[PDB]
């Protein structure tokens, strides 16, 4: 698996690939690993699929309920804190997952959450077996002064590099852009393919 | 064990073989591994037989209850979510199964569900020990434009090849076709046998 | 890894892919796994790279020596028996390999040799983590009456299928054809790429 | 694997199937498990393929040598004793095999030899994972007064029954008959095939 | 232990031997392993004696209760399903048993149930350490067209063969015949003894 | 540790960092991991220091010996084969190392060699705990058309990114350029630092 | 991790670095490890991030509640005792943390609390993988007569030295000073950078 | 144990404490851990006493022999390389030691050598359980410009701080200074005590 | 740790040192290990700090409660019996401690209580890793006739000898004397130092 | 076991008890543990009796041979070094002993040697299970100014105290005094008894 979330001045971009393996065995080429969980909030999943899919359903339900109760979206940090508490509670019988939570409240945020509920905010973050490959690209090429368009190109580059070197990563790249103006937008896959072609990439 | 599920334009095809082993010991040549669990919903089982059979009984009961209560059939993705929740709830004392849920609501769907409740939708999928052989045949021969008759032939060819190479697979091939017109329909044995003869195959 | 050997009327066709992994980490995209070891003899390797490469060097050397001493090529069955004896000798400290030996003496032969020196002749055979997918394709598609050109297409198709479903397989497909008339001939890469386009495949 | 040896009044009949597996994976459908090792002596092999193949080569070598040196064939019991000595000598680094040794010296004999060199003569014997099924058929149906053609049908019946119930057994049945008049005679496949039809069986 | 159940046209025949061991130590020569549990229903027991005896008491109790409540006998399949549910419910603290359930409802049925509640219907089935020998005899000799007296001789033949080769099987053979006309009928020992003589057997 | 070797048109560039840790404990900040071992041959070391240092000493000794005896430099492929043979011969008592061998004979070559003596040629390679980060950068930014100055910048960037994300990597970057015109030249430290500044980097 | 707390005449100084690793992998460079938990009370964390973070939330909640209820701040010794009771209660299912609690009531205090609730007051203390390096610097350079400006330099020095030798420590140094006059005050990053520059340090 | 070696312009300074423990048990308060092994070469020992004492005797013997044979002292790097080869050779039955080798040839050197024979030169180094405390002092206080008197003080400070925090370190500090002019000079206890008294320290 | 309690005619004397370790690591030099728990009752602690501190708080609380309820101090034997019952009750999840309880009721008492709640009265006792050294001093030098001044000296001697040979013992010696006339009296540090100086000792 | 060796101005005193146990079982009350091994050299043994006794025989043989060969006694340090070499050589198949070697050459010496050949000179030392009690007494009561009469009393006291607290120590105390004037002299039992009586002791 490879997932990434980056912050820019007024945006969060989150992306994953789609391969689902059991050891060497590529069972699914198009699993889904990037979810909208609230108006300006996205989540990526890595680790054990069953555990992660249950968390996605919970987060969808709880953030929708919180919004109804509070008349405002849960702050991004509050999402990360909720998950932190839920995961640490079952520490010794854990959800075996790595999560990224990204969103916009008054500012863009990316939080990385581990299976013991450790939660840390970052400028960018990657999860899954492909993540070290992504950190290479990001360390080398990321800039805070990037535009959304360059940010989208960077994450495609980073996940494409990870797909080349991580056999547990593969398939189409899903990208979402989150802004206050347009909200959470999953980019059309034809737009991703066009960017892929132009950047000179394969698979 | 070998099971398969494929989607076509407006149909789902499900098939299995029937061998029940304890190690090398073929105890039963005609076990049943393919089940109707709702009007337009079928399920295959692989793994521990007592676990899988309990799941089949539950799913029959719950899907009948749901549609009496709702006056509509549970959507296929809802069937997969339900199982996903049940299986994950007990992941540290699991149903030791792999499941295929296939059916048609507004569209055809095949879902693959593992012992921890991970559930992934696919265009086609296969489970059991014979499954890598099936995936070989399907990678090579599947087309999204196949007719129902061609799909039926494809799954027969795929299971027959798994039977030639997987000693834990054998016996007669059970096939069911699911359409909006007829619902879930298990094909007559004599029809499967006629297709086996006319494809130049064995068993 | 995926390798395959098939016999036809007066030919042997052997093919591999080129991916070298360290668990999930794709270290090399272009390893070599198919070797000419004598005038009409080839060998494919799967398993521990260092063990397999040492065996390739031995075999090249011993068969060169043998033909100098005997003034005729080592018979294919003799090659397989030599290897069988060598590998069984060290059964408790083994070469952790699966080998295919293919070639022509008075007739085409493919031998499959395991890490304990078990050696069996077959009309076709496959090794590596991708082999069950190949076995699927060959069970449904292989025919004794195939021509060389259709045999070459069959192995490209089989390995293309393995690569789609085995994350430990990947890279360019290497093919050699062995005949009495032409000797051992590795097909040029651009011919393999041409066949991949015309058959409708990826990479 | 299933092998069988029976003694009759002035005859030994020896038979096997031909399936070679790694776990559930049927690698070869036509392995060879029945060998002539001397003028009036046959041997069947079960267990680890590389070990058993080495023993077959050694036995063919040594009984040939002994014959040339003694100017008489090694007595069947001396054959079983040589093997007994060889296997016991390496009990702690064993040949992981079960052997039947059958033939005519001044009388029909069948010997059954284990991986520690334990050797016992019997009127009939069976080895491999399919042998419990064979013992069933033989207990029920064997008679010392049977003729060769009856003996032949018996072993075919016994191995067919084993193939039905032992997933590690399969493939064509090989039968040899050993007499002082005709020596060791492997029966032609068409003749085995014809007896399978007239007995009412399969494969 | 050896038990067997066969279906015939309008009959079920069920049989056991009677040996009860702790390891090699024959404690009892005449244990009872065949029980009537309903008007037209029998059950055989194999595995841990205390577990199987508790299940026999429960089944006699519950089928009697159910009969009084429903005013019809529990259908044979419902019997196998009840057991399936019960055994699976305690899979992690199991009844360490193998069960055969046989009888007449609108047709003859034999069900084989394992320690995890896996339950499969078959035309015939065998349990216990002696069952591989029985499967041999049945594969070779069973015919759906047999009469009851032929069916009876068959099971006697099969268990005698098992007693010859399974040291954990022994003692007198108990046979029951179940029909709609005569109900469940345990055959008198003298009648079993007389058939053993005329078939040419022992014990 | 982080090492990298890349090939260019007529050049090899090899680089490392210098951190020697004992778990978390940074013992030495300036260990040497890049060595000239022949006139146009460099080696990098990763893994157990004492093992790697012994192999460095052997290789300097043996390539000097060989050059003197043959009156030509050992071909790069022969250096890797030599290592491959040595490492494989002791694979059950191994040198716990990963080595890169790079240089120029008639062409530039980089070889990667593992602790079992598996040796593979590549256009580029990286070893050590920091290597995944390096592969990310190389995948994204490597081009076969780069000039030497560009290639020197690439490896500084790749190693700098690894140092940022791999706590077992750190210290000054060592770089060697190997050409037929100039031989093996270690770039002066002042020059690496200069490129570090100009590229916008640290350490 | 490296954290430190020192007492002076009427002051407490607490500092940490910010590196978050999973083994050698630097996930976050700017994690937070020093928190104000009450008006005149701070806390540092080390060990499992999820456990520590939950404990930070509890202490902020409980120290606020206590003060509301008591109309005075919890004494620092009472904070340490509360923690010590909570950690000891769950010592067989522990919070896997080392904690520093520092503050001012009628006097300055630093307490060190382990995962089993053992709690000891000291004049200074350090926790995490970097703490032995820190104790080196403090043993050599701590004086009870130091001014707040001096103690601030001292902890910057301690932590800087730890970051040079502990690869699990890194990133910006955080520092808070606690006094009766100003309460708990976090020093601005620009002031710590200026002091790192003035003292002649790096990282 | 605590040992330390530092280089200055034209000097090496080496120092240890003297505590010999068996777990918590202080067997000897006055062991010796610093040895002159050649005219301008000293060695410190840490780890298993028996192993380290044997190595001291070998080194003294071999360096004396070598000086006699070569008519020059073994270069310090040669001493470290000798130890490297020796320790690596017995890697699987190791001397369980950490060594510092210090001396002057054409320049001052300190080498650190581990139990697998990994050997690294540094400006300074420490070994033993007390070494982390020493690294803290040196990182904070070491200067390459220091005079001999200042370096002597530094190492006393460093060892004194280690003694305060490491219960396996204790007893009198031994110090030797090595120069070209004066040779290896072990400083009189009275002089070290006077410095411990002057610098304001303990023990 | 070293603790000691001795009885004299009309007095109890109790003493500890103050070292708190984590293996070799001296975390705290000044921990407290001797506590007054009632008017004429003291307690020393050894073993796991968290567990021992929790027990100190319970004892102080319960003995105060009991004094309020009964209007007499709990008898020393009752205090030991209370601890006995408490510790024994949680035997399988124990407080991992060694306790001394000392005091005066109608007579002086010292009790020693283990982690399973075994409790024994003695004339004197010691606990901790330093206790064997203490038993040596007491056996040689203890007299029942000693005065308080002499007993104070004895225990200082005893603890000082333990500190010299036990690296897990260290720091200032705390002493309390308990009498009917004066109550529990913790001796001023200055007085203990004066005795350490007078008696000719260290630390 | 308890053994002790002390040095005085011109004297060595060595003593042991005599108890031999197998766990709690006192097999021998009067075993021997102190031996003269050369004119002015004694040795005590502790640990496995058979290992110790073989070592006593070797040292008596070798020290006699050496003296015959050298015409002088082996220096005590040379004795300790010899032992240290021998024990270290076999450290992975060790003599499971603790040894004291004491004697007079130009000065008195006591050396303590462990099972891995670690050897350290000290002013006094003790070995065996009773040694911690002994170190208690010696720390408190040893003086370098003692006379031989005083040191003899001191070791009787040390050992008597050990016998009171160590159940694996017991029986008569053996004592030897070593001087230049009289050599090694074993004290008569009547003299030790008289001193035990005079000092006020038991056992």
Curated annotation (Swiss-Prot), chains A, B, C, D, E, F, G, H, I, J:
<dbReference type="InterPro" id="IPR023333">
    <property type="entry name" value="Proteasome_suB-type"/>
</dbReference>
<feature type="active site" description="Nucleophile">
    <location>
        <position position="1"/>
    </location>
</feature>
<dbReference type="InterPro" id="IPR016050">
    <property type="entry name" value="Proteasome_bsu_CS"/>
</dbReference>
<dbReference type="GO" id="GO:0005737">
    <property type="term" value="C:cytoplasm"/>
</dbReference>
<dbReference type="GO" id="GO:0004298">
    <property type="term" value="F:threonine-type endopeptidase activity"/>
</dbReference>
<comment type="function">
    <text>Component of the proteasome core, a large protease complex with broad specificity involved in protein degradation. The T.acidophilum proteasome is able to cleave oligopeptides after Tyr, Leu, Phe, and to a lesser extent after Glu and Arg. Thus, displays chymotrypsin-like activity and low level of caspase-like and trypsin-like activities.</text>
</comment>
<dbReference type="GO" id="GO:0019774">
    <property type="term" value="C:proteasome core complex, beta-subunit complex"/>
</dbReference>
<dbReference type="InterPro" id="IPR000243">
    <property type="entry name" value="Pept_T1A_subB"/>
</dbReference>
<comment type="subunit">
    <text>The 20S proteasome core is composed of 14 alpha and 14 beta subunits that assemble into four stacked heptameric rings, resulting in a barrel-shaped structure. The two inner rings, each composed of seven catalytic beta subunits, are sandwiched by two outer rings, each composed of seven alpha subunits. The catalytic chamber with the active sites is on the inside of the barrel. Has a gated structure, the ends of the cylinder being occluded by the N-termini of the alpha-subunits. Is capped at one or both ends by the proteasome regulatory ATPase, PAN.</text>
</comment>
<keyword id="KW-0068">Autocatalytic cleavage</keyword>
<keyword id="KW-0963">Cytoplasm</keyword>
<dbReference type="InterPro" id="IPR029055">
    <property type="entry name" value="Ntn_hydrolases_N"/>
</dbReference>
<keyword id="KW-0888">Threonine protease</keyword>
<keyword id="KW-0378">Hydrolase</keyword>
<dbReference type="Pfam" id="PF00227">
    <property type="entry name" value="Proteasome"/>
</dbReference>
<dbReference type="InterPro" id="IPR019983">
    <property type="entry name" value="Pept_T1A_Psome_bsu_arc"/>
</dbReference>
<comment type="similarity">
    <text>Belongs to the peptidase T1B family.</text>
</comment>
<dbReference type="InterPro" id="IPR001353">
    <property type="entry name" value="Proteasome_sua/b"/>
</dbReference>
<dbReference type="GO" id="GO:0010498">
    <property type="term" value="P:proteasomal protein catabolic process"/>
</dbReference>
<dbReference type="GO" id="GO:0004175">
    <property type="term" value="F:endopeptidase activity"/>
</dbReference>
<protein>
    <recommendedName>
        <fullName>Proteasome subunit beta</fullName>
        <ecNumber>3.4.25.1</ecNumber>
    </recommendedName>
</protein>
<keyword id="KW-0647">Proteasome</keyword>
<keyword id="KW-0645">Protease</keyword>
<keyword id="KW-0865">Zymogen</keyword>
